[PDB]
Scaffold this motif. Structure first.
Motif, PDB file in Angstrom:
ATOM      1  N   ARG B  20     -17.191  22.544  -1.946  1.00  0.00           N
ATOM      2  CA  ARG B  20     -16.931  23.192  -0.665  1.00  0.00           C
ATOM      3  C   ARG B  20     -17.922  24.327  -0.419  1.00  0.00           C
ATOM      4  NH1 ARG B  20     -12.306  23.907  -4.509  1.00  0.00           N
ATOM      5  NH2 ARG B  20     -11.370  25.558  -3.220  1.00  0.00           N
ATOM      6  N   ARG B  21     -18.418  24.917  -1.502  1.00  0.00           N
ATOM      7  CA  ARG B  21     -19.372  26.015  -1.405  1.00  0.00           C
ATOM      8  C   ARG B  21     -20.804  25.489  -1.367  1.00  0.00           C
ATOM      9  NH1 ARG B  21     -17.528  30.951  -0.223  1.00  0.00           N
ATOM     10  NH2 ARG B  21     -17.553  32.209  -2.141  1.00  0.00           N
ATOM     11  N   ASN B  22     -20.998  24.279  -1.879  1.00  0.00           N
ATOM     12  CA  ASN B  22     -22.320  23.663  -1.905  1.00  0.00           C
ATOM     13  C   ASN B  22     -22.349  22.399  -1.050  1.00  0.00           C
ATOM     14  OD1 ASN B  22     -24.448  24.601  -4.406  1.00  0.00           O
ATOM     15  ND2 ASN B  22     -25.091  22.951  -3.025  1.00  0.00           N
ATOM     16  N   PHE B  23     -21.358  21.535  -1.247  1.00  0.00           N
ATOM     17  CA  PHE B  23     -21.268  20.290  -0.495  1.00  0.00           C
ATOM     18  C   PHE B  23     -20.382  20.460   0.736  1.00  0.00           C
ATOM     19  CE2 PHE B  23     -22.360  18.526  -4.730  1.00  0.00           C
ATOM     20  CZ  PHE B  23     -23.493  17.830  -4.355  1.00  0.00           C
ATOM     21  N   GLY B  24     -19.945  21.692   0.977  1.00  0.00           N
ATOM     22  CA  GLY B  24     -19.094  21.966   2.121  1.00  0.00           C
ATOM     23  C   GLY B  24     -19.703  22.984   3.065  1.00  0.00           C
ATOM     24  N   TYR B  25     -20.371  23.985   2.503  1.00  0.00           N
ATOM     25  CA  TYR B  25     -20.998  25.030   3.303  1.00  0.00           C
ATOM     26  C   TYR B  25     -22.038  24.439   4.251  1.00  0.00           C
ATOM     27  CZ  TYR B  25     -20.418  30.098   3.230  1.00  0.00           C
ATOM     28  OH  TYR B  25     -20.023  31.390   3.499  1.00  0.00           O
ATOM     29  N   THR B  26     -22.505  23.237   3.931  1.00  0.00           N
ATOM     30  CA  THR B  26     -23.502  22.560   4.752  1.00  0.00           C
ATOM     31  C   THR B  26     -23.081  22.533   6.216  1.00  0.00           C
ATOM     32  OG1 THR B  26     -24.946  20.602   4.847  1.00  0.00           O
ATOM     33  CG2 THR B  26     -22.570  20.221   4.646  1.00  0.00           C
ATOM     34  N   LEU B  27     -21.774  22.463   6.451  1.00  0.00           N
ATOM     35  CA  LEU B  27     -21.241  22.432   7.807  1.00  0.00           C
ATOM     36  C   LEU B  27     -21.811  23.573   8.644  1.00  0.00           C
ATOM     37  CD1 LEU B  27     -17.469  21.664   8.493  1.00  0.00           C
ATOM     38  CD2 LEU B  27     -19.484  21.208   9.903  1.00  0.00           C
ATOM     39  N   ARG B  28     -22.111  24.689   7.987  1.00  0.00           N
ATOM     40  CA  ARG B  28     -22.663  25.852   8.669  1.00  0.00           C
ATOM     41  C   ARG B  28     -24.188  25.812   8.666  1.00  0.00           C
ATOM     42  NH1 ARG B  28     -18.526  30.665   6.627  1.00  0.00           N
ATOM     43  NH2 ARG B  28     -19.548  32.142   8.054  1.00  0.00           N
TER      44      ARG B  28
END
Lengths: 16, 28
Positions: B20-28
């Motif tokens: 979520r911090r690496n494979f999720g933060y991408t959303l931003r």
């Protein structure tokens, strides 16, 4: 808590 | 480099934040 496999279409898809 | 993130997701004991911090933060 799975957002890297439900959003990563182009990434987890063929990006690998 | 995602298989390790999907297999660890089933390991509540294993601290996984790169999903979520690496494979999720991408959303931003």
């Amino acid at each position: 808590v799975a957002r890297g496999w439900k959003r990563k279409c182009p990434l987890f898809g063929k990006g690998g | 480099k995602y298989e390790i993130t999907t297999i660890h997701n089933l390991f509540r004991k294993l601290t996984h934040r790169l999903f979520r911090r690496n494979f999720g933060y991408t959303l931003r």
